[PDB]
Design a protein around this motif. Structure first.
Motif, PDB file in Angstrom:
ATOM      1  N   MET A 113       0.842  -1.223   0.000  1.00  0.00           N
ATOM      2  CA  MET A 113       0.000   0.000   0.000  1.00  0.00           C
ATOM      3  C   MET A 113       0.884   1.284   0.000  1.00  0.00           C
ATOM      4  SD  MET A 113      -3.102   0.664   2.718  1.00  0.00           S
ATOM      5  CE  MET A 113      -2.166   1.432   4.054  1.00  0.00           C
ATOM      6  N   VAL A 114       0.974   1.952  -1.158  1.00  0.00           N
ATOM      7  CA  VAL A 114       1.745   3.218  -1.299  1.00  0.00           C
ATOM      8  C   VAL A 114       0.780   4.383  -0.913  1.00  0.00           C
ATOM      9  CG1 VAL A 114       3.236   4.609  -2.890  1.00  0.00           C
ATOM     10  CG2 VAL A 114       3.258   2.133  -3.137  1.00  0.00           C
ATOM     11  N   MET A 115       0.946   4.946   0.299  1.00  0.00           N
ATOM     12  CA  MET A 115       0.133   6.096   0.769  1.00  0.00           C
ATOM     13  C   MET A 115       0.779   7.424   0.271  1.00  0.00           C
ATOM     14  SD  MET A 115      -0.871   7.039   4.720  1.00  0.00           S
ATOM     15  CE  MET A 115      -1.972   5.708   5.225  1.00  0.00           C
ATOM     16  N   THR A 116       0.133   8.080  -0.704  1.00  0.00           N
ATOM     17  CA  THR A 116       0.576   9.409  -1.215  1.00  0.00           C
ATOM     18  C   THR A 116      -0.286  10.518  -0.530  1.00  0.00           C
ATOM     19  OG1 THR A 116       1.345   8.345  -3.274  1.00  0.00           O
ATOM     20  CG2 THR A 116       1.047  10.687  -3.424  1.00  0.00           C
ATOM     21  N   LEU A 117       0.287  11.181   0.489  1.00  0.00           N
ATOM     22  CA  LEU A 117      -0.415  12.213   1.296  1.00  0.00           C
ATOM     23  C   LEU A 117      -0.152  13.614   0.667  1.00  0.00           C
ATOM     24  CD1 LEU A 117       1.022   9.916   3.392  1.00  0.00           C
ATOM     25  CD2 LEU A 117       0.011  11.335   5.155  1.00  0.00           C
ATOM     26  N   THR A 118      -1.106  14.126  -0.123  1.00  0.00           N
ATOM     27  CA  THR A 118      -1.031  15.498  -0.706  1.00  0.00           C
ATOM     28  C   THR A 118      -1.690  16.533   0.258  1.00  0.00           C
ATOM     29  OG1 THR A 118      -1.760  16.914  -2.598  1.00  0.00           O
ATOM     30  CG2 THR A 118      -2.983  14.917  -2.402  1.00  0.00           C
ATOM     31  N   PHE A 119      -0.903  17.498   0.757  1.00  0.00           N
ATOM     32  CA  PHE A 119      -1.436  18.811   1.218  1.00  0.00           C
ATOM     33  C   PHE A 119      -1.171  19.859   0.086  1.00  0.00           C
ATOM     34  CE2 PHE A 119      -0.703  22.608   4.134  1.00  0.00           C
ATOM     35  CZ  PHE A 119      -2.004  22.739   4.613  1.00  0.00           C
ATOM     36  N   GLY A 120      -1.981  19.794  -0.993  1.00  0.00           N
ATOM     37  CA  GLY A 120      -1.691  20.498  -2.272  1.00  0.00           C
ATOM     38  C   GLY A 120      -0.358  20.095  -2.948  1.00  0.00           C
ATOM     39  N   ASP A 121       0.600  21.033  -2.963  1.00  0.00           N
ATOM     40  CA  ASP A 121       1.998  20.750  -3.401  1.00  0.00           C
ATOM     41  C   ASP A 121       2.942  20.082  -2.333  1.00  0.00           C
ATOM     42  OD1 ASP A 121       3.676  22.635  -6.043  1.00  0.00           O
ATOM     43  OD2 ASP A 121       4.738  21.188  -4.617  1.00  0.00           O
ATOM     44  N   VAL A 122       2.579  19.956  -1.038  1.00  0.00           N
ATOM     45  CA  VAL A 122       3.429  19.262  -0.019  1.00  0.00           C
ATOM     46  C   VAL A 122       3.011  17.751  -0.010  1.00  0.00           C
ATOM     47  CG1 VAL A 122       4.272  19.300   2.431  1.00  0.00           C
ATOM     48  CG2 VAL A 122       3.731  21.469   1.359  1.00  0.00           C
ATOM     49  N   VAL A 123       3.798  16.904  -0.696  1.00  0.00           N
ATOM     50  CA  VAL A 123       3.413  15.490  -0.994  1.00  0.00           C
ATOM     51  C   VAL A 123       4.374  14.527  -0.221  1.00  0.00           C
ATOM     52  CG1 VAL A 123       2.918  13.781  -2.884  1.00  0.00           C
ATOM     53  CG2 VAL A 123       2.477  16.174  -3.352  1.00  0.00           C
ATOM     54  N   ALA A 124       3.824  13.681   0.667  1.00  0.00           N
ATOM     55  CA  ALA A 124       4.593  12.602   1.338  1.00  0.00           C
ATOM     56  C   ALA A 124       4.238  11.187   0.790  1.00  0.00           C
ATOM     57  CB  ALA A 124       4.313  12.704   2.842  1.00  0.00           C
ATOM     58  N   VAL A 125       5.255  10.379   0.446  1.00  0.00           N
ATOM     59  CA  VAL A 125       5.046   9.023  -0.161  1.00  0.00           C
ATOM     60  C   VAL A 125       5.505   7.949   0.878  1.00  0.00           C
ATOM     61  CG1 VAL A 125       5.262   7.538  -2.251  1.00  0.00           C
ATOM     62  CG2 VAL A 125       5.546   9.993  -2.565  1.00  0.00           C
ATOM     63  N   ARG A 126       4.548   7.287   1.544  1.00  0.00           N
ATOM     64  CA  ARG A 126       4.839   6.370   2.682  1.00  0.00           C
ATOM     65  C   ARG A 126       4.452   4.908   2.300  1.00  0.00           C
ATOM     66  NH1 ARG A 126       2.747  11.181   6.990  1.00  0.00           N
ATOM     67  NH2 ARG A 126       4.232  12.578   6.097  1.00  0.00           N
ATOM     68  N   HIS A 127       5.449   4.008   2.299  1.00  0.00           N
ATOM     69  CA  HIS A 127       5.353   2.686   1.618  1.00  0.00           C
ATOM     70  C   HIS A 127       5.023   1.574   2.659  1.00  0.00           C
ATOM     71  CE1 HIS A 127       7.817   5.058  -1.285  1.00  0.00           C
ATOM     72  NE2 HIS A 127       7.327   4.321  -2.332  1.00  0.00           N
ATOM     73  N   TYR A 128       3.742   1.198   2.746  1.00  0.00           N
ATOM     74  CA  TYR A 128       3.233   0.261   3.775  1.00  0.00           C
ATOM     75  C   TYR A 128       3.211  -1.197   3.234  1.00  0.00           C
ATOM     76  CZ  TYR A 128       1.346   4.169   6.747  1.00  0.00           C
ATOM     77  OH  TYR A 128       1.164   5.258   7.556  1.00  0.00           O
ATOM     78  N   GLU A 129       3.743  -2.134   4.026  1.00  0.00           N
ATOM     79  CA  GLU A 129       3.770  -3.583   3.664  1.00  0.00           C
ATOM     80  C   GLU A 129       2.926  -4.425   4.680  1.00  0.00           C
ATOM     81  OE1 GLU A 129       7.629  -4.948   1.611  1.00  0.00           O
ATOM     82  OE2 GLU A 129       8.444  -2.967   2.438  1.00  0.00           O
TER      83      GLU A 129
END
Length: 131
Positions: A113-129
């Motif tokens: 599960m690749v969680m892409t957290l967008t606060f508009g242009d502030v983007v965090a990519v958190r890789h869940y297994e």
């Protein structure tokens, strides 16, 4: 929905510091989100989807049907009007507060599960297994 029903542990975090500072956290949550791993247990309990986000400092849970709008007191210290739905095999948690929005795009890449957290242009990519 069935490929998302699992115990999800965070394995690789792109941007877990500036996303918290942009969202409007209390500074103890900025100290916690750098040190701690979240265990996100996505579970259909009876009929509705119950997500349990559990770490060794912050522990919170959300009960929803797909399309339910619910006010949610987060680990930031904010109550958000939260709408959760699948777009195209991708689980999108839309959190609305004070004029501001963030959406968490959870997508299955080969069991992960690749969680892409967008606060508009502030983007965090958190890789869940799975466990």
């Amino acid at each position: 929905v069935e490929a998302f029903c699992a115990t999800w542990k965070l394995t690789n975090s792109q941007n877990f510091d500036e996303y918290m500072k942009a969202l409007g956290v209390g500074f103890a949550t900025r100290q916690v989100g750098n040190v701690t791993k979240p265990t996100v247990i996505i579970s259909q309990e009876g009929d509705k989807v119950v997500i349990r986000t559990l770490s060794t400092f912050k522990n919170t849970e959300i009960s929803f049907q797909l399309g339910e709008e619910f006010d949610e007191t987060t680990a930031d210290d904010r109550n958000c009007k939260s709408v959760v739905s699948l777009d195209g095999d991708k689980l999108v948690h839309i959190q609305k507060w004070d004029g501001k929005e963030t959406n968490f795009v959870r997508e299955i890449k080969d069991g992960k599960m690749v969680m892409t957290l967008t606060f508009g242009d502030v983007v965090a990519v958190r890789h869940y297994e799975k466990a």
